[PDB]
Write an enzyme that holds these catalytic residues in place. Structure first.
Site, mmCIF file in Angstrom:
data_model
loop_
_atom_site.group_PDB
_atom_site.id
_atom_site.type_symbol
_atom_site.label_atom_id
_atom_site.label_comp_id
_atom_site.label_asym_id
_atom_site.label_seq_id
_atom_site.Cartn_x
_atom_site.Cartn_y
_atom_site.Cartn_z
ATOM 1 N N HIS A 71 0.755 -1.170 -0.191
ATOM 2 C CA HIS A 71 -0.119 -0.049 0.171
ATOM 3 C C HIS A 71 0.736 1.406 -0.036
ATOM 4 O O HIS A 71 0.564 2.284 0.444
ATOM 5 C CB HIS A 71 -0.955 -0.033 1.309
ATOM 6 C CG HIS A 71 -1.957 -1.330 1.201
ATOM 7 N ND1 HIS A 71 -2.677 -1.540 0.226
ATOM 8 C CD2 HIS A 71 -1.888 -2.170 2.110
ATOM 9 C CE1 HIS A 71 -3.257 -2.782 0.417
ATOM 10 N NE2 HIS A 71 -2.810 -3.208 1.588
ATOM 11 N N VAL A 113 -6.797 -1.266 -2.173
ATOM 12 C CA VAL A 113 -6.380 -1.111 -3.407
ATOM 13 C C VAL A 113 -5.459 0.040 -3.588
ATOM 14 O O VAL A 113 -5.179 0.404 -4.933
ATOM 15 C CB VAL A 113 -7.436 -0.935 -4.409
ATOM 16 C CG1 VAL A 113 -8.325 -2.148 -4.454
ATOM 17 C CG2 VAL A 113 -8.531 0.139 -4.170
ATOM 18 N N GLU A 114 -4.959 0.561 -2.624
ATOM 19 C CA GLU A 114 -3.812 1.563 -2.631
ATOM 20 C C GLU A 114 -2.743 0.455 -2.866
ATOM 21 O O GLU A 114 -2.257 -0.305 -2.067
ATOM 22 C CB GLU A 114 -3.566 2.275 -1.128
ATOM 23 C CG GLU A 114 -4.818 3.220 -0.878
ATOM 24 C CD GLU A 114 -4.802 3.616 0.469
ATOM 25 O OE1 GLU A 114 -3.809 3.364 1.259
ATOM 26 O OE2 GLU A 114 -5.986 4.176 0.933
ATOM 27 N N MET A 115 -1.831 0.885 -3.957
ATOM 28 C CA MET A 115 -0.569 0.158 -4.465
ATOM 29 C C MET A 115 0.669 0.980 -4.202
ATOM 30 O O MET A 115 0.665 2.110 -4.326
ATOM 31 C CB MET A 115 -1.165 -0.477 -5.796
ATOM 32 C CG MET A 115 -2.310 -1.308 -5.681
ATOM 33 S SD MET A 115 -2.270 -2.374 -7.154
ATOM 34 C CE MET A 115 -3.396 -3.702 -6.559
#
Ligand code: HEC
Ligand code: HEC
Length: 316
Positions: A71, A113-115
Protein backbone atom coordinates in the site's frame (compact mmCIF):
# COMPACT_ATOMS: atom_id res chain seq x y z
CA UNK A 1 -33.43 -14.57 26.92
CA UNK A 2 -32.62 -11.07 28.11
CA UNK A 3 -28.94 -11.85 27.45
CA UNK A 4 -29.82 -12.77 23.87
CA UNK A 5 -31.98 -9.65 23.64
CA UNK A 6 -29.16 -7.44 24.95
CA UNK A 7 -26.62 -9.10 22.66
CA UNK A 8 -28.92 -8.40 19.72
CA UNK A 9 -29.13 -4.73 20.65
CA UNK A 10 -25.32 -4.32 20.69
CA UNK A 11 -24.28 -6.70 17.90
CA UNK A 12 -25.37 -8.25 14.60
CA UNK A 13 -24.65 -11.50 12.72
CA UNK A 14 -22.78 -11.62 9.38
CA UNK A 15 -25.44 -11.56 6.60
CA UNK A 16 -25.48 -13.90 3.59
CA UNK A 17 -24.49 -11.12 1.15
CA UNK A 18 -22.12 -8.16 1.68
CA UNK A 19 -23.32 -4.53 1.57
CA UNK A 20 -22.76 -2.81 -1.77
CA UNK A 21 -19.80 -0.46 -1.48
CA UNK A 22 -19.78 2.76 -3.55
CA UNK A 23 -22.37 1.30 -5.90
CA UNK A 24 -20.09 -1.61 -6.86
CA UNK A 25 -22.74 -4.22 -7.71
CA UNK A 26 -21.22 -7.71 -7.56
CA UNK A 27 -21.26 -9.93 -10.63
CA UNK A 28 -19.69 -13.29 -11.34
CA UNK A 29 -17.31 -11.75 -13.89
CA UNK A 30 -16.11 -8.96 -11.62
CA UNK A 31 -15.61 -11.26 -8.64
CA UNK A 32 -13.70 -13.83 -10.74
CA UNK A 33 -11.42 -11.13 -12.15
CA UNK A 34 -10.93 -9.69 -8.67
CA UNK A 35 -9.96 -13.14 -7.35
CA UNK A 36 -7.38 -13.59 -10.12
CA UNK A 37 -5.90 -10.23 -9.19
CA UNK A 38 -5.98 -10.94 -5.47
CA UNK A 39 -3.60 -13.86 -6.14
CA UNK A 40 -1.69 -12.15 -8.97
CA UNK A 41 1.99 -11.67 -7.95
CA UNK A 42 3.03 -9.85 -11.10
CA UNK A 43 1.46 -6.57 -9.93
CA UNK A 44 4.41 -6.18 -7.56
CA UNK A 45 7.67 -4.86 -9.03
CA UNK A 46 9.49 -7.99 -7.81
CA UNK A 47 6.71 -10.29 -9.06
CA UNK A 48 7.05 -12.16 -5.77
CA UNK A 49 4.15 -10.54 -3.87
CA UNK A 50 0.35 -10.67 -4.21
CA UNK A 51 -2.51 -9.64 -1.87
CA UNK A 52 -2.68 -13.22 -0.62
CA UNK A 53 0.96 -12.99 0.45
CA UNK A 54 -0.08 -10.63 3.27
CA UNK A 55 -3.77 -11.55 3.60
CA UNK A 56 -3.58 -15.35 3.35
CA UNK A 57 -7.17 -16.46 2.90
CA UNK A 58 -6.25 -19.91 4.14
CA UNK A 59 -4.66 -18.62 7.31
CA UNK A 60 -6.72 -15.84 8.86
CA UNK A 61 -6.71 -13.37 5.97
CA UNK A 62 -3.71 -11.57 7.44
CA UNK A 63 0.07 -11.82 7.83
CA UNK A 64 2.02 -13.56 10.56
CA UNK A 65 4.85 -11.02 10.61
CA UNK A 66 4.78 -7.20 10.83
CA UNK A 67 5.78 -5.59 7.53
CA UNK A 68 7.01 -2.26 6.18
CA UNK A 69 5.75 -2.68 2.64
CA UNK A 70 2.45 -2.82 0.78
CA UNK A 71 0.00 0.00 0.00
CA UNK A 72 2.78 2.46 -0.79
CA UNK A 73 3.69 2.51 2.91
CA UNK A 74 6.90 4.42 3.64
CA UNK A 75 7.24 4.16 7.42
CA UNK A 76 8.05 1.52 10.03
CA UNK A 77 6.67 -2.03 10.14
CA UNK A 78 3.07 -2.55 11.23
CA UNK A 79 0.72 -5.51 11.72
CA UNK A 80 -1.71 -6.46 8.95
CA UNK A 81 -5.50 -6.56 9.49
CA UNK A 82 -7.57 -9.44 8.14
CA UNK A 83 -9.46 -9.05 4.87
CA UNK A 84 -12.22 -11.20 6.36
CA UNK A 85 -15.37 -9.09 6.86
CA UNK A 86 -13.34 -5.93 6.25
CA UNK A 87 -16.19 -4.78 4.05
CA UNK A 88 -18.37 -4.18 7.14
CA UNK A 89 -15.90 -1.80 8.81
CA UNK A 90 -16.49 1.95 8.34
CA UNK A 91 -13.05 2.75 9.74
CA UNK A 92 -9.84 1.31 8.34
CA UNK A 93 -6.73 -0.03 10.06
CA UNK A 94 -4.88 3.02 11.38
CA UNK A 95 -1.49 3.28 12.94
CA UNK A 96 -0.65 6.97 12.76
CA UNK A 97 -1.60 10.60 13.25
CA UNK A 98 -5.20 11.53 13.93
CA UNK A 99 -4.49 14.71 11.98
CA UNK A 100 -3.89 12.63 8.83
CA UNK A 101 -7.25 10.85 8.87
CA UNK A 102 -9.24 13.58 7.12
CA UNK A 103 -7.26 13.48 3.89
CA UNK A 104 -5.67 10.03 3.95
CA UNK A 105 -8.21 7.61 5.45
CA UNK A 106 -10.82 5.69 3.46
CA UNK A 107 -12.96 2.60 3.74
CA UNK A 108 -11.11 -0.76 4.19
CA UNK A 109 -12.13 -1.99 0.75
CA UNK A 110 -10.75 1.16 -0.88
CA UNK A 111 -7.64 1.26 1.33
CA UNK A 112 -6.99 -2.26 0.12
CA UNK A 113 -6.43 -1.12 -3.47
CA UNK A 114 -3.89 1.54 -2.58
CA UNK A 115 -0.78 0.18 -4.33
CA UNK A 116 2.99 0.61 -4.24
CA UNK A 117 3.40 -0.14 -7.97
CA UNK A 118 2.59 2.72 -10.34
CA UNK A 119 -0.68 2.62 -12.31
CA UNK A 120 1.11 2.53 -15.67
CA UNK A 121 3.20 -0.47 -14.66
CA UNK A 122 0.12 -2.39 -13.50
CA UNK A 123 -2.01 -1.62 -16.56
CA UNK A 124 0.86 -2.48 -18.92
CA UNK A 125 1.33 -5.79 -17.09
CA UNK A 126 -2.37 -6.63 -17.31
CA UNK A 127 -2.61 -5.58 -20.98
CA UNK A 128 0.35 -7.79 -21.88
CA UNK A 129 -1.82 -10.88 -21.39
CA UNK A 130 -4.72 -11.70 -23.73
CA UNK A 131 -6.69 -13.57 -21.05
CA UNK A 132 -6.67 -10.58 -18.70
CA UNK A 133 -8.04 -8.39 -21.49
CA UNK A 134 -10.86 -10.89 -22.00
CA UNK A 135 -11.58 -11.05 -18.27
CA UNK A 136 -11.76 -7.26 -18.12
CA UNK A 137 -14.10 -7.27 -21.14
CA UNK A 138 -16.29 -9.85 -19.37
CA UNK A 139 -16.36 -7.79 -16.18
CA UNK A 140 -16.88 -4.39 -17.79
CA UNK A 141 -19.25 -4.95 -20.73
CA UNK A 142 -19.79 -1.87 -22.89
CA UNK A 143 -16.42 -0.27 -22.12
CA UNK A 144 -14.06 0.17 -25.12
CA UNK A 145 -10.81 0.19 -23.11
CA UNK A 146 -11.80 -1.88 -20.03
CA UNK A 147 -8.26 -2.49 -18.75
CA UNK A 148 -7.66 0.54 -16.54
CA UNK A 149 -6.29 1.04 -13.03
CA UNK A 150 -9.74 2.09 -11.80
CA UNK A 151 -11.48 -0.96 -13.26
CA UNK A 152 -8.75 -3.16 -11.75
CA UNK A 153 -9.50 -1.53 -8.39
CA UNK A 154 -13.25 -2.06 -8.83
CA UNK A 155 -12.82 -5.80 -9.62
CA UNK A 156 -10.53 -6.33 -6.61
CA UNK A 157 -13.02 -4.46 -4.38
CA UNK A 158 -15.78 -6.71 -5.67
CA UNK A 159 -13.77 -9.77 -4.63
CA UNK A 160 -12.88 -8.18 -1.25
CA UNK A 161 -16.59 -7.74 -0.56
CA UNK A 162 -17.13 -11.50 -0.89
CA UNK A 163 -14.59 -12.34 1.82
CA UNK A 164 -17.11 -12.62 4.65
CA UNK A 165 -17.53 -15.42 7.20
CA UNK A 166 -21.12 -16.30 8.16
CA UNK A 167 -22.46 -18.87 10.63
CA UNK A 168 -20.17 -18.45 13.62
CA UNK A 169 -21.66 -20.02 16.81
CA UNK A 170 -22.28 -16.49 18.15
CA UNK A 171 -24.23 -15.54 15.03
CA UNK A 172 -26.41 -18.65 15.43
CA UNK A 173 -26.99 -17.57 19.03
CA UNK A 174 -27.96 -14.05 17.94
CA UNK A 175 -30.37 -15.61 15.49
CA UNK A 176 -32.12 -17.60 18.23
CA UNK A 177 -30.15 -20.80 18.80
CA UNK A 178 -29.89 -20.47 22.56
CA UNK A 179 -27.75 -23.62 22.66
CA UNK A 180 -25.12 -22.24 20.25
CA UNK A 181 -23.12 -21.04 23.27
CA UNK A 182 -22.40 -23.00 26.45
CA UNK A 183 -22.73 -21.42 29.90
CA UNK A 184 -19.05 -20.52 30.07
CA UNK A 185 -19.28 -18.59 26.78
CA UNK A 186 -22.53 -16.90 27.79
CA UNK A 187 -20.81 -15.69 30.96
CA UNK A 188 -18.10 -14.24 28.75
CA UNK A 189 -20.73 -12.49 26.62
CA UNK A 190 -22.44 -10.96 29.64
CA UNK A 191 -19.08 -9.74 30.97
CA UNK A 192 -18.03 -8.31 27.59
CA UNK A 193 -21.20 -6.21 27.71
CA UNK A 194 -21.16 -5.49 31.48
CA UNK A 195 -17.52 -4.39 31.64
CA UNK A 196 -17.98 -1.82 28.86
CA UNK A 197 -15.95 -3.42 26.04
CA UNK A 198 -18.91 -2.54 23.85
CA UNK A 199 -18.07 1.16 24.18
CA UNK A 200 -15.59 0.51 21.38
CA UNK A 201 -16.17 -3.06 20.13
CA UNK A 202 -19.76 -3.48 18.96
CA UNK A 203 -21.91 -3.85 15.87
CA UNK A 204 -21.46 -6.50 13.19
CA UNK A 205 -17.69 -7.01 13.72
CA UNK A 206 -17.37 -6.14 17.42
CA UNK A 207 -15.12 -3.21 16.57
CA UNK A 208 -13.81 -1.60 13.38
CA UNK A 209 -16.08 1.47 13.40
CA UNK A 210 -14.09 4.20 15.22
CA UNK A 211 -10.59 5.46 16.03
CA UNK A 212 -9.30 5.97 19.58
CA UNK A 213 -6.15 7.48 21.15
CA UNK A 214 -5.48 4.20 22.98
CA UNK A 215 -2.92 1.68 21.78
CA UNK A 216 -0.73 -1.21 22.87
CA UNK A 217 2.57 -0.31 24.54
CA UNK A 218 5.45 -2.50 25.66
CA UNK A 219 6.01 -1.56 29.32
CA UNK A 220 -0.46 -9.08 30.55
CA UNK A 221 2.53 -8.06 32.64
CA UNK A 222 4.70 -7.05 29.69
CA UNK A 223 2.20 -4.96 27.73
CA UNK A 224 -0.65 -2.54 28.31
CA UNK A 225 -3.08 -0.25 26.51
CA UNK A 226 -2.58 3.43 27.28
CA UNK A 227 -3.63 6.79 25.90
CA UNK A 228 -1.26 8.34 23.37
CA UNK A 229 0.60 11.56 24.26
CA UNK A 230 -1.71 14.47 23.46
CA UNK A 231 -3.99 12.00 21.64
CA UNK A 232 -1.69 12.68 18.66
CA UNK A 233 -1.82 9.08 17.43
CA UNK A 234 -4.98 7.02 17.15
CA UNK A 235 -5.84 3.43 16.37
CA UNK A 236 -8.97 1.80 15.06
CA UNK A 237 -10.79 -0.29 17.68
CA UNK A 238 -10.13 -3.78 16.30
CA UNK A 239 -13.05 -5.75 14.87
CA UNK A 240 -12.84 -8.89 17.08
CA UNK A 241 -14.70 -11.22 14.76
CA UNK A 242 -12.55 -14.30 13.94
CA UNK A 243 -9.94 -13.17 16.45
CA UNK A 244 -9.15 -16.86 17.01
CA UNK A 245 -7.67 -16.94 13.49
CA UNK A 246 -5.93 -13.58 13.39
CA UNK A 247 -2.92 -13.67 15.70
CA UNK A 248 -0.62 -11.78 16.17
CA UNK A 249 -2.55 -8.87 17.69
CA UNK A 250 -2.70 -5.05 17.84
CA UNK A 251 -1.20 -2.45 15.50
CA UNK A 252 2.27 -3.81 16.24
CA UNK A 253 1.47 -7.51 16.25
CA UNK A 254 3.47 -7.84 19.48
CA UNK A 255 0.95 -10.07 21.24
CA UNK A 256 0.26 -13.69 20.30
CA UNK A 257 -1.83 -14.65 23.30
CA UNK A 258 -5.57 -13.98 23.10
CA UNK A 259 -5.89 -14.10 26.89
CA UNK A 260 -3.22 -11.43 27.20
CA UNK A 261 -4.86 -9.32 24.47
CA UNK A 262 -8.05 -9.38 26.53
CA UNK A 263 -6.20 -8.69 29.80
CA UNK A 264 -4.39 -5.54 28.67
CA UNK A 265 -7.75 -4.07 27.57
CA UNK A 266 -9.22 -4.29 31.07
CA UNK A 267 -8.21 -1.01 32.70
CA UNK A 268 -9.50 1.41 35.31
CA UNK A 269 -9.04 4.37 32.99
CA UNK A 270 -11.24 2.74 30.34
CA UNK A 271 -13.57 1.48 33.06
CA UNK A 272 -13.09 -2.10 31.85
CA UNK A 273 -11.22 -3.58 34.85
CA UNK A 274 -11.31 -7.41 34.95
CA UNK A 275 -10.11 -10.13 37.31
CA UNK A 276 -8.40 -13.27 35.97
CA UNK A 277 -11.54 -15.43 35.87
CA UNK A 278 -13.47 -12.84 33.84
CA UNK A 279 -10.57 -12.51 31.41
CA UNK A 280 -10.84 -16.25 30.75
CA UNK A 281 -14.62 -16.07 30.38
CA UNK A 282 -14.31 -13.32 27.76
CA UNK A 283 -11.67 -15.33 25.90
CA UNK A 284 -14.16 -18.22 25.78
CA UNK A 285 -16.77 -15.86 24.34
CA UNK A 286 -14.43 -14.35 21.72
CA UNK A 287 -13.64 -17.85 20.46
CA UNK A 288 -17.30 -18.14 19.42
CA UNK A 289 -16.79 -15.41 16.78
CA UNK A 290 -15.04 -17.66 14.23
CA UNK A 291 -17.18 -17.98 11.11
CA UNK A 292 -17.01 -20.13 7.98
CA UNK A 293 -13.99 -19.16 5.89
CA UNK A 294 -15.21 -18.86 2.30
CA UNK A 295 -14.23 -21.66 -0.06
CA UNK A 296 -11.71 -20.49 -2.62
CA UNK A 297 -10.81 -22.14 -5.93
CA UNK A 298 -7.18 -21.12 -6.55
CA UNK A 299 -7.15 -19.13 -9.80
CA UNK A 300 -5.15 -20.28 -12.82
CA UNK A 301 -3.40 -17.14 -14.04
CA UNK A 302 -2.26 -16.54 -17.64
CA UNK A 303 1.39 -16.89 -18.67
CA UNK A 304 3.58 -13.85 -19.08
CA UNK A 305 4.35 -12.68 -22.62
CA UNK A 306 7.13 -10.79 -24.34
CA UNK A 307 5.33 -7.57 -23.36
CA UNK A 308 4.91 -8.50 -19.72
CA UNK A 309 7.26 -6.31 -17.69
CA UNK A 310 9.93 -8.57 -16.18
CA UNK A 311 10.54 -9.15 -12.44
CA UNK A 312 12.78 -6.55 -10.81
CA UNK A 313 15.95 -7.81 -9.06
CA UNK A 314 16.79 -7.86 -5.34
CA UNK A 315 18.74 -4.77 -4.27
CA UNK A 316 17.97 -3.37 -0.80
C1 HEC B 1 2.05 -6.82 2.56
C2 HEC B 1 3.38 -6.32 1.99
C3 HEC B 1 0.70 -6.40 1.92
C4 HEC B 1 0.26 -6.57 0.66
C5 HEC B 1 0.95 -7.19 -0.58
C6 HEC B 1 -1.13 -6.09 0.64
N1 HEC B 1 -1.50 -5.67 1.89
FE1 HEC B 1 -3.34 -5.13 2.46
N2 HEC B 1 -2.59 -4.44 4.14
C7 HEC B 1 -1.30 -4.62 4.65
C8 HEC B 1 -1.12 -3.93 5.92
C9 HEC B 1 0.17 -3.93 6.79
C10 HEC B 1 -2.28 -3.25 6.15
C11 HEC B 1 -2.46 -2.28 7.36
C12 HEC B 1 -2.30 -1.10 6.39
C13 HEC B 1 -2.23 0.19 5.69
O1 HEC B 1 -1.27 0.22 4.91
O2 HEC B 1 -3.41 0.18 5.29
C14 HEC B 1 -3.22 -3.65 5.10
C15 HEC B 1 -4.57 -3.35 4.98
C16 HEC B 1 -5.51 -3.83 4.09
C17 HEC B 1 -6.97 -3.70 4.14
C18 HEC B 1 -7.72 -2.92 5.25
C19 HEC B 1 -8.52 -3.80 6.23
C20 HEC B 1 -9.26 -3.00 7.28
O3 HEC B 1 -8.91 -1.86 7.58
O4 HEC B 1 -10.21 -3.63 7.85
C21 HEC B 1 -7.50 -4.41 3.13
C22 HEC B 1 -8.98 -4.67 2.79
C23 HEC B 1 -6.38 -4.89 2.33
N3 HEC B 1 -5.20 -4.58 2.98
C24 HEC B 1 -6.46 -5.53 1.12
C25 HEC B 1 -5.41 -5.81 0.31
C26 HEC B 1 -5.55 -6.23 -1.07
C27 HEC B 1 -6.90 -6.47 -1.79
C28 HEC B 1 -4.27 -6.30 -1.54
C29 HEC B 1 -3.76 -6.63 -2.95
C30 HEC B 1 -4.13 -5.51 -3.97
C31 HEC B 1 -3.38 -6.04 -0.44
N4 HEC B 1 -4.08 -5.68 0.69
C32 HEC B 1 -1.99 -6.15 -0.44
C33 HEC B 1 -0.35 -5.34 3.97
C34 HEC B 1 -0.39 -5.82 2.69
C1 HEC C 1 -12.08 2.01 23.43
C2 HEC C 1 -11.57 3.13 24.35
C3 HEC C 1 -11.86 0.52 23.82
C4 HEC C 1 -12.40 -0.20 24.82
C5 HEC C 1 -13.38 0.26 25.94
C6 HEC C 1 -11.91 -1.58 24.64
N1 HEC C 1 -11.06 -1.66 23.56
FE1 HEC C 1 -10.18 -3.31 22.81
N2 HEC C 1 -9.16 -2.20 21.53
C7 HEC C 1 -9.26 -0.82 21.31
C8 HEC C 1 -8.34 -0.37 20.29
C9 HEC C 1 -8.16 1.06 19.76
C10 HEC C 1 -7.62 -1.45 19.92
C11 HEC C 1 -6.44 -1.48 18.94
C12 HEC C 1 -5.13 -1.14 19.72
C13 HEC C 1 -3.79 -1.24 19.03
O1 HEC C 1 -2.76 -0.99 19.69
O2 HEC C 1 -3.73 -1.68 17.89
C14 HEC C 1 -8.17 -2.58 20.64
C15 HEC C 1 -7.78 -3.92 20.53
C16 HEC C 1 -8.26 -5.05 21.18
C17 HEC C 1 -7.86 -6.44 21.00
C18 HEC C 1 -6.79 -6.89 19.99
C19 HEC C 1 -7.56 -7.32 18.74
C20 HEC C 1 -6.75 -7.63 17.49
O3 HEC C 1 -5.60 -7.24 17.38
O4 HEC C 1 -7.38 -8.34 16.63
C21 HEC C 1 -8.60 -7.20 21.82
C22 HEC C 1 -8.59 -8.71 22.06
C23 HEC C 1 -9.47 -6.28 22.53
N3 HEC C 1 -9.24 -4.98 22.12
C24 HEC C 1 -10.37 -6.62 23.52
C25 HEC C 1 -11.12 -5.80 24.32
C26 HEC C 1 -11.92 -6.27 25.44
C27 HEC C 1 -12.14 -7.73 25.86
C28 HEC C 1 -12.39 -5.14 26.05
C29 HEC C 1 -13.21 -5.07 27.35
C30 HEC C 1 -12.40 -5.42 28.62
C31 HEC C 1 -11.96 -4.03 25.23
N4 HEC C 1 -11.15 -4.42 24.19
C32 HEC C 1 -12.25 -2.68 25.41
C33 HEC C 1 -10.15 -0.06 22.03
C34 HEC C 1 -11.00 -0.38 23.06
Amino acid sequence: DNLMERANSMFEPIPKYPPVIDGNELTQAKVELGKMEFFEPRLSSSHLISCNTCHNVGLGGDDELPTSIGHGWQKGPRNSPTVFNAVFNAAQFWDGRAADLAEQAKGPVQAGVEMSSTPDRVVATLKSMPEYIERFEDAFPGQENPVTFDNMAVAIEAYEATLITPEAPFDKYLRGDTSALNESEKEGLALFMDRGCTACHSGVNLGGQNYYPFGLVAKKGRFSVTETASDEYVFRASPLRNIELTAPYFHSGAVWSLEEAVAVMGTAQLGTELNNDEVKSIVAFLKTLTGNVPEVTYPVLPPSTANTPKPVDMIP
